[PDB]
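#struct-pred

JT: dropping the chains for the assembly here, can someone run the whole complex?
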Amino acid sequence: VQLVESGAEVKKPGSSVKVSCKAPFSSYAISWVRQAPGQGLEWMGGIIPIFGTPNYAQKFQGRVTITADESTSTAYMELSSLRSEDTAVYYCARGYCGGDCYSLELVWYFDLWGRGTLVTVSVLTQPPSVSGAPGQRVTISCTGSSSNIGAGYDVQWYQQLPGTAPKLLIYGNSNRPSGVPDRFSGSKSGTSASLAITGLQAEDEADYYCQSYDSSLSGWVFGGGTKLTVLAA
Amino acid sequence: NLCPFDEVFNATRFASVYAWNRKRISNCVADYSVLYNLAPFFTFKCYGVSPTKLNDLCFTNVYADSFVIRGDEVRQIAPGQTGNIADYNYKLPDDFTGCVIAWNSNKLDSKVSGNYNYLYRLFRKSNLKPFERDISTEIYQAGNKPCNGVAGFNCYFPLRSYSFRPTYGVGHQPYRVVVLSFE
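RK: done, full complex below.
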């Protein structure tokens, strides 16, 4: 199974894109996130198919419409009144709640990400950059507030190598998914959270993003992103 | 206007008890007629309040907590009780003033194969304080050794499913519960 999205689009300023997203999903959460070229991940909004009212980030409140069609098995994001700023890659992500998703708040992880639909139109704080010694331990901080990490919401961490979609790295605060080696650890204390990598390898050189739910803005929020670079001995 | 109580009961879906839903009823008059049409035999157990006080709430603020547990456990949604639902999932105070509504939902919430979609928290380090909500999924350490992000021997993924089937006993059958509270 892999989320399949519509193809890239070149749109004039002022137009609207409708990006499709199909599971080749009524139990899951659909979440839409974008990444403008060279920037971090932004949460756009999300829906619980069939039983859901769509939920949007305030940046995108009057311009985005998230729909789900049960028949055709596809989820749609329609962003209207496009500016140059909306040039980005648009991802859709499936969230597991262990069974059925009452709400987008209860998502454990967004495990399956889409492709990228690239649309070209003619907050948690992270260290922007961290340098690590190969074979040694690095940490990446995620600092939040009493509306998110400190409200009792768990931190997820994602990895992005160049060109791919994020990959889930730890959910829970500390839980490794299947496939993620023991070298990665997670920790949460108060209003801050941390990813640690031990025995650093040249392959670990990637961008890392944390994520949590915020109850005051009632949505998902991402960190600014961390560019981990592995040094030489 | 009228209170949105047809959206508390007769909601399309009910939450797991570990993620119990709270909805505010703020400034309205109440009709509980929907209760006769959802639940032939229900229960409306008020502590320290007449349930006629829940009829006028035009200048009062009411919290409606809703979830699905099993019938053996409805006795834990009551003041001064202990169990796994009271201890780890939904805890009413000992000074509780308010009402607890409950009814059999074996006909909506059970499946011949088994409905594994409703969960309860099985493991926790401390007991929940009154009106607390722990929706974390962090692995629980039951042993003296670290869990390292993964369940296994003495390390328990903290939520478990409920296994609801129609062939079960009235006790082991899914009940919807609604706790009315005052703010």
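JT: nice. Residues 88 and 126 of chain B are 8 Å apart (CA to CA). Helices of chain B lie at 34-38, 71-74, 85-88, 106-109.
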